[PDB]
Amino acid sequence: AVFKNITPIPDVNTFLDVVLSRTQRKTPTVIRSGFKISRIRGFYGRKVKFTQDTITEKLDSILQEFPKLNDIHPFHADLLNILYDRDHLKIALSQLSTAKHLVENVARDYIRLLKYGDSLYRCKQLKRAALGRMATIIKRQKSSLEFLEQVRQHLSRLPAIDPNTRTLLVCGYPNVGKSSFMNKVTRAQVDVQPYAFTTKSLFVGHFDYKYLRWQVIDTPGINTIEMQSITAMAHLRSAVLYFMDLSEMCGYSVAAQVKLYHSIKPLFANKVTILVLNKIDAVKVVQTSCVQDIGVMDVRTTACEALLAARLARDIEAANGGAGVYNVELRDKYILQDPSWKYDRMPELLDGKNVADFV
Amino acid sequence: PKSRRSKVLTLAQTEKKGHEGKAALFSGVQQSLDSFDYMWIFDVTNMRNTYLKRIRDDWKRIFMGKTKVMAKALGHTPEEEHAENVSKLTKLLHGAVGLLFTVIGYFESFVQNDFARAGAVAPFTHVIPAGPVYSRAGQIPLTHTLEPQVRQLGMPTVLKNGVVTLLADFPLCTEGQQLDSRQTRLLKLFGITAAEFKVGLLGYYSKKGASVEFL
Amino acid sequence: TSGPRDNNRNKWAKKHLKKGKRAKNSNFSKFLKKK
Amino acid sequence: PQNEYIEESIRKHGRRFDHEERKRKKAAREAHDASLYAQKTRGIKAKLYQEKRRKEKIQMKKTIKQHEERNKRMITKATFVKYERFIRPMALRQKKANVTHKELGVTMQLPIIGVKKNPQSPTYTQLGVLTKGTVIEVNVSELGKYAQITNNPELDGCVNALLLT
Amino acid sequence: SLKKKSKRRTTRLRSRIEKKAAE
Amino acid sequence: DIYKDETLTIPKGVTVDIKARNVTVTGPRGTLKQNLRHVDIEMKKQGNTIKFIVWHGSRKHNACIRSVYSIINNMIIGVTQGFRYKMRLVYAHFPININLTENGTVVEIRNFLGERITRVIKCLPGVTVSISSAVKDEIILEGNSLENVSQSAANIKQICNVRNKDIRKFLDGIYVSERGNIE
RNA sequence: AUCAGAGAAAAGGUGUUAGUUCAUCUAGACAGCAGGACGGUGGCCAUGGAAGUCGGAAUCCGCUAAGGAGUGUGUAA
RNA sequence: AAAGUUACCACAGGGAUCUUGUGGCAGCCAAGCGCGACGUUGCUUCGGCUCUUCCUAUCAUACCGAAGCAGAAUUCGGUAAGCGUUGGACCCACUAAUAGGGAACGUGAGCUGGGACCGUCGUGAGACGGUUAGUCUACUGAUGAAG
């Protein structure tokens, strides 16, 4: 799912034109009446088989590109179902598979019928009949291609989460400063907007602390976004980083945040919980001044500890002539006393005797 | 076929009557001329339609239609014209001026401010500060969400960090200079209401007096 | 790979004629000329 | 990256400096491009543009019209299954026929119960050869009734017939 | 020719063109 | 049509002679020469007015009258006011290094997108290249021939072309920002 | 005619030339500049939301010189 | 008493002897000229080695266009035949790639592999014969008289 690596899905009209053009360009297209009936039958059969092979190959590639929902991880499958109606996607894939099987059956029937062809017109009519039926089947499966293409675009844009490694899930009230803390902690810069549910989708960012890799995953404020956040937090080996607005500057009262945390406690069970008192200047309780940006590093270190407990010569060469063009001279880098002697050469061998080896 | 420019079409279905619409405007102007009194000559100005509607609200209706169409329909010659001595009044009658019935003091004194347009001259020389753009020339107690305004403006502004930034200062207008197309567009975008609507009440077409003064 | 008639390669050959060639060959001819 | 990342890039950095003008120029010059295209291209791709442009004019004319009102010895033909002197190929033989009802106007795939009469030849009628104009009886319980084959099964590849009703 | 194909046609080809024009 | 004419009034430019269809316009800024031998148009010079006349011409040849009229007007504008093109450098990570040689007649560009290739572009005759001081990373193309200046700007933009990358994200390049007269 | 000239046919062409018909036009023809392009109303639903322009039904209206329950871009809106 | 019939027919004889990429059928519309286009409803003996060139309807190489095309790796589409397009047994591995075709009997005077009549005995059936009958030129280089 998150692996993407799926080729673009063309439209129904584009796919039909691509298939027909490929068959026309690859297969021969010169068959006169002077050839034998067997040759005419063979030419028609070859064209039909090539068209069938091209259609089958594209359909198989489309079917293989879409990952199986069952084989995906429980967190990935839940997110896909919440975001893209996995039941509808499975129905579309099944419909495409059925259409491919029907196309292959139609091609096989047409090939068998054309094997006993009579004349050029009968072969030409049979060749047209198979192509039209394949085109009709392709045109019939029109909305499925559009739905699959949208799913592929969403899947490619989706993040590649890694719940297996140590992770810190930041979820809670919208704009409670958890997103700002996650943006500061990780290299990723999550967009923050005054409108609620600004981070509609999850944002995952890697971080390094105490020679360990921690995956900071932000969640939408708590709707489809809320449901996706709940599904991600349900199946993930991660530490909860719920943030409560101490100053209530996020628009959510302290009592409301506490009630939401108590309700979401079922998902936060069997995990290290952190209660981040946001906007202090404006379950382990840690005070982090969202307005003053104070205590974020301490909270991150505390959460990480809880999770762990729970679990030049080159410059000269480039300036002079550049790499591969500048000849480095080892004569200069010598400890010879006389500079003239170091820069001057000596006879290695003379008169049949190695002067260097005999001096 | 032939080399001709293509003509575009839309689906509003709100086309005016054209010749019939002009005839209706002339008929309404004649009825307004035949109205009771107040002998108003005022239709529009540089102000917006909302200002015109507000002005027309305090009346019991400003209407001109096409400029000089009513005068042409009435006739330059006094015999053709319903009024008297309209030969000289026809030349004076021009622009957006129309009859109305309710005023004189409000027109003379009250002149609501409105956004300026091209062709006029700004009363001062407003200078746009460099750096981040200010919607109200730094009078707000300037949102950064006007990203599309950077492309729409066309001025030397670079969208740096999602905020429009001006590399160098550029005055919007200069005193003693006519309002150009860009200057008028910038003035309309900003808070520059360098305009004041006026009215024309030189004369009155009295039923009995029939004395349209030229003052 | 591009062939020897690659238009860019001819352009780069022209550029390098006046960089690592030309002058050091002209005076080279001059030296054995005055000889 | 995550989700709409160039949409994040467009937000925080901006668009290409001249994209709006280039897209405007491309749209403006498209008319010259299409007219040029209609004259230079040749072959299959030209014939596709010819058919595609003819279609576009037809729908465009309609959309305007919708605008204004708003304002060896073997059988060589497909058959259905001494007397069998010839050979009837199994692949050529067909058992199901697509019969379209006249009043209902619906095509139903019914089994070929038998062949009533083939006007081409009584031997073909005896052999049950499915040809154009041949009368064949099919089950109508789910709708037995006769029907005339209005197509050529040897060329179309399907037994497309119309109900005699 | 000059294009790809000879404008001049075979004599039997001309006659059958005349025959095709007739029918 | 029998008669198809375009009339042009001349400014204080000294010479607008069209001898042998060769327009040699000498103005306060300088002298520009162009050859209009590819158009069969009468060039009548009377006083302060020039008439481009075509008799019994087809539509294809008739379209040349206005095109000739504009290009002559453009070069007359050059000899009187001149043309100036302002282009803004655009760079995301690597600043684009621009150096001017022979008073700017040749521009060599380095450090583009990290590339070590030194792209050398020579401007067309009648054009000079300068670096603006009021605005950073600003290149000014001024001269007499509008076509030469615009062609030089197009050549610079075409040379600085991002290849094999996503245009939607990669925005590095040199583009025209302002086109107009010297004063 | 960058493939001139000496059945493949249904068509396509911002290729040219004549006509045929119908339309506007000093009440100002097109085209271009300068503007308006409004008020109920964010009509009614829809959903993180869609204020004419996610979308589904309505398609009313006062004012005018004219402004749609909106031509598209755009907007999270 | 036999007679009709045979397209269920069988055994002998006599006569005759341009091509490529869009399915069909049935309806609803349906610009228009009873048809009626685009749209819309249903349902489903041959066969292959070498070789020479040639075509492009391009597998690779070169350059562009588009696509949620971040990068990389791709996919699709243009120009394009200059240059290539293996080695072994549906494979296999290498390879940048292991593209499709023509030389109408591709190159069998480059190359190789996987009877007829008559008679006789004959029911619904098949075999045991007598005759028989084939048909200088071009290119590669080498000299060479001569205004």
Curated annotation (Swiss-Prot), chain A:
Q: Tell me where in this chain the OBG-type G domain is found.
A: 166-308
This entry's Gene Ontology molecular function terms read: GTP binding; GTPase activity; RNA binding
Q: Where in the cell is it found?
A: Nucleus, Nucleolus
Q: What is one cellular component GO term in this UniProt entry?
A: preribosome
Q: Which UniProt keywords apply?
A: GTP-binding, Nucleotide-binding, Nucleus, Phosphoprotein, Ribosome biogenesis
The record lists GTP as bound by 172-179, 218-222, 278-281
Q: Name one GO biological process term.
A: assembly of large subunit precursor of preribosome
Sequence intervals crossing the membrane: none
Function, as annotated? Involved in the biogenesis of the 60S ribosomal subunit.
Family in the record? Belongs to the TRAFAC class OBG-HflX-like GTPase superfamily. OBG GTPase family. NOG subfamily.
Q: What is this protein called?
A: Probable nucleolar GTP-binding protein 1
Q: Which organism does this record belong to? A: Schizosaccharomyces pombe (strain 972 / ATCC 24843)
Gene name of this polypeptide: nog1
> What range of the parent protein does this fragment cover?
4 to 445 of 642
Swiss-Prot record, chain B:
Q: Which domain of life is it from?
A: Eukaryota
Its annotated compartments are: Nucleus, Nucleolus; Cytoplasm
Which key words are in the record?
Answer: Cytoplasm, Nucleus, Ribosome biogenesis
A Gene Ontology annotation in the biological process aspect, one of them, is: nuclear-transcribed mRNA catabolic process
Any one annotated GO CC term: cytoplasm
CDD domains per UniProt? Ribosomal_P0_like
Task: Enumerate the InterPro entries for this protein.
Answer: Mrt4 (IPR033867), Ribosomal_uL10 (IPR001790), Ribosomal_uL10-like_insert (IPR040637), Ribosomal_uL10-like_insert_sf (IPR043164), Ribosomal_uL10-like_sf (IPR043141), Ribosome_Assembly_uL10 (IPR051742)
- What protein family does this chain belong to? Belongs to the universal ribosomal protein uL10 family.
**What does the subunit section of this Swiss-Prot or TrEMBL entry state?**
Associates with the pre-60S ribosomal particle.
Q: Which PANTHER family match?
A: MRNA TURNOVER PROTEIN 4 HOMOLOG, MRNA TURNOVER PROTEIN 4 MRTO4
Annotated protein name in UniProt: Ribosome assembly factor mrt4
From Swiss-Prot, chain D:
Asked if the Swiss-Prot or TrEMBL record annotates the protein with the keyword Ribonucleoprotein, the reply is yes
GO terms of biological process kind: assembly of large subunit precursor of preribosome; maturation of 5.8S rRNA; maturation of LSU-rRNA
Q: Which domain of life is it from?
A: Eukaryota
Family matches, as Pfam families: Ribosomal_S8e
Q: Where is this motif: Nuclear localization signal?
A: 10-17
- Which segments show compositional bias classed as Basic and acidic residues? 52-71
Give the primary localization class.
Answer: nucleus
Q: Where is the composition biased (Basic residues)?
A: 12-27
Q: Where in the cell is it found?
A: Nucleus, Nucleolus
Provide this UniProt record's keywords sorted from A to Z. Answer: Nucleus, Phosphoprotein, Ribonucleoprotein, Ribosome biogenesis, rRNA processing
Report residue spans for region: Disordered. 1-33, 52-71
Q: So what family is this one in?
A: Belongs to the eukaryotic ribosomal protein eS8 family. Ribosome biogenesis protein NSA2 subfamily.
Subunit structure of this entry? Answer: Component of the pre-66S ribosomal particle. Interacts with ppp1/nop7 and nop52/rrp1. Interacts with rsa4 (via WD repeats).
| Task performed by this protein | Involved in the biogenesis of the 60S ribosomal subunit. May play a part in the quality control of pre-60S particles.
Name the record gives this protein: Ribosome biogenesis protein nsa2
Instruction: State the species of origin.
Output: Schizosaccharomyces pombe (strain 972 / ATCC 24843) (Fission yeast)
UniProtKB/Swiss-Prot annotation, chain F:
The record ties this protein, via Pfam families, to: Ribosomal_L6 (PF00347)
A GO MF annotation of the entry reads: structural constituent of ribosome
Task: Tell me the keywords, alphabetical order.
Answer: Cytoplasm, Nucleus, Ribonucleoprotein, Ribosomal protein
Report the locations given in the UniProt record: Cytoplasm; Nucleus
Q: Which cysteines are joined by disulfide bonds?
A: none
Q: What else is known?
A: There are 2 genes for uL6 in S.pombe.
Q: In its UniProt entry, what is this protein called? A: Large ribosomal subunit protein uL6A
Stated role: Component of the ribosome, a large ribonucleoprotein complex responsible for the synthesis of proteins in the cell. The small ribosomal subunit (SSU) binds messenger RNAs (mRNAs) and translates the encoded message by selecting cognate aminoacyl-transfer RNA (tRNA) molecules. The large subunit (LSU) contains the ribosomal catalytic site termed the peptidyl transferase center (PTC), which catalyzes the formation of peptide bonds, thereby polymerizing the amino acids delivered by tRNAs into a polypeptide chain.
Instruction: Please name the source species.
Output: Schizosaccharomyces pombe (strain 972 / ATCC 24843) (Fission yeast)
Q: Which family does it belong to?
A: Belongs to the universal ribosomal protein uL6 family.
Which Gene Ontology terms of cellular component type are present?
A: cytosol; cytosolic large ribosomal subunit; nucleus; preribosome
One of the protein's GO biological processes: cytoplasmic translation
Matching entries from InterPro entries are given as: Ribosomal_uL6-like, Ribosomal_uL6-like_a/b-dom_sf, Ribosomal_uL6_a/b-dom, Ribosomal_uL6_CS2
Superkingdom is: Eukaryota
